[PDB]
Amino acid sequence: MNMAHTTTSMEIFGSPEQVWQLIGGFNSLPDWLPYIPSSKLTEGGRVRHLANPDGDTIIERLEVFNDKERYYTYSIMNAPFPVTNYLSTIQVKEGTESNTSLVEWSGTFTPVEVSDEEAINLFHGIYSDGLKALQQAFLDL
Amino acid sequence: MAHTTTSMEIFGSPEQVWQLIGGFNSLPDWLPYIPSSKLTEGGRVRHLANPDGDTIIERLEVFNDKERYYTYSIMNAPFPVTNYLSTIQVKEGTESNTSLVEWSGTFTPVEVSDEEAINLFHGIYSDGLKALQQAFLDLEHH
Numbered sequence: 001m002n003m004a005h006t007t008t009s010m011e012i013f014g015s016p017e018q019v020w021q022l023i024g025g026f027n028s029l030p031d032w033l034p035y036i037p038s039s040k041l042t043e044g045g046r047v048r049h050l051a052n053p054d055g056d057t058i059i060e061r062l063e064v065f066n067d068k069e070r071y072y073t074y075s076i077m078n079a080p081f082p083v084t085n086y087l088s089t090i091q092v093k094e095g096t097e098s099n100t101s102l103v104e105w106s107g108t109f110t111p112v113e114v115s116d117e118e119a120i121n122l123f124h125g126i127y128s129d130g131l132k133a134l135q136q137a138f139l140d141l
Numbered sequence: 142m143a144h145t146t147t148s149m150e151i152f153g154s155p156e157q158v159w160q161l162i163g164g165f166n167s168l169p170d171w172l173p174y175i176p177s178s179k180l181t182e183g184g185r186v187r188h189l190a191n192p193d194g195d196t197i198i199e200r201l202e203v204f205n206d207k208e209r210y211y212t213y214s215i216m217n218a219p220f221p222v223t224n225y226l227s228t229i230q231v232k233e234g235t236e237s238n239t240s241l242v243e244w245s246g247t248f249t250p251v252e253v254s255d256e257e258a259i260n261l262f263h264g265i266y267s268d269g270l271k272a273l274q275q276a277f278l279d280l281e282h283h
Contacts (some may be wrong), residue, residue: 025183043186044164046206065204065211067185 009091017100020070083109146245149270172269222248
């Protein structure tokens with residue numbers, strides 16, 4: 001119990017549903033994250049193996065999933081990150097217009113071998129870069 | 142709309158039973174009726190084959206690992222229903238190492254009576270829950 005927090009929200013030029021169709025897949029990070037080469041599912045779709053572009057790997061577990069409320073929460077089973085009790089959620093909220101959406105990527109975790117600020121900086125950077133790339137891909141009809 | 146539910150106690154902790162049936166793509170590991178399954182859409186959609194080679198496409202609506210349940214709908218299948226919704230949940234049993242699995246369904250029967258729609262799905266649910274009960278009964282050791 002330490003639990004650091006970080007979040008980042010960003011407007012995407014696409015209807016919430018359309019945006020969720022592209023990012024709501026647990027194994028679909030490679031379709032929108034320019035930092036993920038490939039993703040593999042295990043346990044009938046409950047576990048994803050991300051092939052990190054550095055030899056290391058990230059294994060995560062789907063914790064919660066709701067199609068219509070457009071969101072999914074997941075936890076880390078095995079990754080090189082310097083934290084524990086990692087829990088992250090990515091949700092597609094209402095945009096400012098009906099053809100717009102606001103994506104939120106949050107995460108709670110316990111820093112280990114790094115300060116709260118350093119871990120907060122790490123994932124905030126990962127989240128923000130992820131959403132900026134997504135913003136880029138959608139305003140590319 | 143029509144509704145139907147089946148329950149079955151299995152000799153396995155709620156967590157064990159769920160490790161085996163909680164995967165959206167794991168039906169062929171325990172449901173005789175679905176010999177083959179495939180996932181698309183990053184895992185949200187599954188393509189099933191029934192014994193007669195018919196294709197069944199369903200979509201994951203809700204999934205909760207901790208509470209051991211998932212809800213899904215039918216996008217397209219040869220079944221005579223519409224507005225199909227089904228949820229499978231693994232509840233606590235009478236012993237810390239047994240559990241109660243529940244498979245429920247709600248649907249609008251099309252071109253068939255409610256009775257006929259209920260029998261079909263109840264039959265499928267029963268088929269799978271019974272195989273599941275037999276699977277664990279095969280303890281085999283300690």
